[PDB]
Design a protein around this ligand. Structure first.
Ligand code: CL
Ligand code: NA
Length: 465
């Protein structure tokens, strides 16, 4: 007995405003997901604290024991009604939802809002004070037992909900043994299963490791993500019997990785998580990943690599942060979309990232594997001004298993002998740009495969003077 008892694979995304925006905005996100082949959307199922609820004119958990709009307030939205609408519309369109129950971070209140309600002084009191645990349990029970006003079906019985997730990006830096979070996750996941035996439960953490033999970061960067600093012991969490699948997130630019290493670091992070998920024997989902648009790299090429690895290595899902749709009011940009406030937004438009997502959705959804051999510059980014020595990075995407060698041409120079494989199909070398005159130049990438050449080119402006 299960509402989603078939291990399926998917491309997914995230959207955090599905519980407080208008029907038109919600419809736009879900229709965009359907049109793009995105089968699962990860959404927030929380709005904690009176100030956060006021800010969005939408009430879910403004005070302890208050689940909805408080007394005394007119013209307010109810976040459960907005979630009910989202679920009903997702159901109509065939989209499944992962509903996250609290935020590690302060956005929409988060753990610290609970700490403030109960007179605590530290974020990590959220995991330890029984009164806070009890209030989280009361909130989760209210949500699981809620009857959707549009469908008439309680959330406990709703197959459109794919999974409950305990906490977005939970961390417990005050206990680097990992034990505080193991105990909390065991307690809360067991509690959810006691109320709802029908749905998958997952943690929602970023996937940090805690000094596992043989697992170190690519390039020695972001050691904190591998050494237990955040209080997350991913392998111990995945071993909890009431946790059905593992989650991990990926943001090399937030975590101290250098741009020349974003692609490989993320690739190794993905492979390491799939390897450890296999060691435990449970499925895994890359449930958030992103590169900011302003980063000095080819984002689409990096996303292509990361999605290739999730698919080829047997991961169950890859979900980008984040999908948006049409905007309204102050949350509307010049093109009519919800704005790209963080540099990660993807919409159903004519971007290369959107086209990549559409392609990969078919691959995950039906195994439609028509990937074609490709090579792309990763650094520099097209149109960049460059000077002194540049660490050129290129990806080779070899689906036919016929790749032989890579070359790069700039003016009369042919780089091939010094191009080094850096792992995962990423190649690199140092280009001393003082060898070429200042000005605009085309850089040509040639992937030599058996029986064909595949190409990429970018323009760069050399500005040594
Ligand atoms: Cl934290
Ligand atoms: Na989101």
């Amino acid at each position: 007995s299960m509402l989603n008892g078939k291990e399926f694979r998917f491309i997914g995304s995230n959207n955090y405003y599905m519980h407080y925006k208008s029907n038109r905005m919600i419809d736009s996100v879900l229709e965009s997901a359907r049109d793009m082949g995105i089968k699962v959307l990860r959404i927030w199922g929380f709005l904690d604290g009176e100030s956060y609820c006021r800010d969005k004119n939408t009430y879910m958990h403004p005070e302890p024991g208050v689940f909805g709009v408080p007394e005394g307030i007119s013209n307010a939205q109810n976040g459960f009604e907005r979630l009910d609408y989202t679920i009903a519309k997702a159901k109509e369109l065939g989209i499944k939802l992962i509903i996250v129950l609290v935020n590690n971070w302060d956005d929409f209140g988060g753990m610290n809002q609970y700490v403030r309600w109960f007179g605590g002084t530290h974020h990590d009191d959220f995991y330890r004070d029984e009164r806070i645990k009890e209030e989280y349990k009361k909130y989760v029970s209210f949500l699981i037992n809620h009857v959707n006003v549009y469908t008439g079906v309680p959330y406990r019985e709703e197959p459109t909900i794919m999974a409950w997730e305990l906490a977005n990006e939970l961390r417990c830096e005050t206990d680097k043994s990992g034990n505080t979070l193991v105990e909390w996750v065991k307690e809360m996941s067991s509690y959810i299963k006691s109320l709802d035996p029908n749905h998958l439960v997952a943690v929602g953490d970023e996937g940090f490791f805690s000094n596992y033999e043989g697992f170190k970061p690519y390039g020695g960067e972001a050691e904190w993500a591998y050494n237990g600093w955040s209080g997350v012991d991913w392998k111990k969490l995945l071993s909890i019997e009431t946790v059905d699948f593992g989650t991990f997130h990926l943001y090399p630019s937030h975590w101290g990785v250098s741009p020349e290493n974003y692609a490989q670091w993320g690739a190794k992070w993905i492979e390491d998580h799939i390897k450890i998920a296999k060691e435990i024997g449970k499925p895994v989902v890359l449930e958030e990943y992103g590169i900011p648009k302003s980063a000095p790299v080819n984002r689409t090429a990096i996303y292509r690599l990361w999605n290739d690895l999730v698919y080829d290595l047997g991961g169950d899902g890859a979900m980008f942060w984040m999908l948006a749709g049409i905007g309204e009011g102050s949350d509307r940009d010049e093109r009519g979309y919800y704005p790209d406030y963080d540099g990660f937004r993807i919409v159903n438009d004519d971007s290369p990232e959107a086209e990549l997502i559409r392609e990969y959705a078919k691959l995950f959804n039906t195994g439609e594997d028509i990937r074609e051999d490709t090579c792309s510059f990763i650094l520099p980014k097209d149109g960049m001004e460059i000077k002194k020595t540049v660490e050129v990075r290129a990806g080779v995407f070899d689906y036919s298993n016929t790749f032989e060698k890579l070359s790069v041409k700039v003016e009369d120079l042919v780089f091939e002998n010094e191009i080094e494989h850096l792992g995962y199909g990423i190649y690199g070398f140092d280009l001393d740009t003082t060898r070429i005159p200042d000005g605009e130049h085309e850089m040509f990438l040639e992937g030599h495969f058996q029986g064909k050449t595949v190409k990429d080119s970018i323009k760069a402006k050399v500005v040594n003077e």
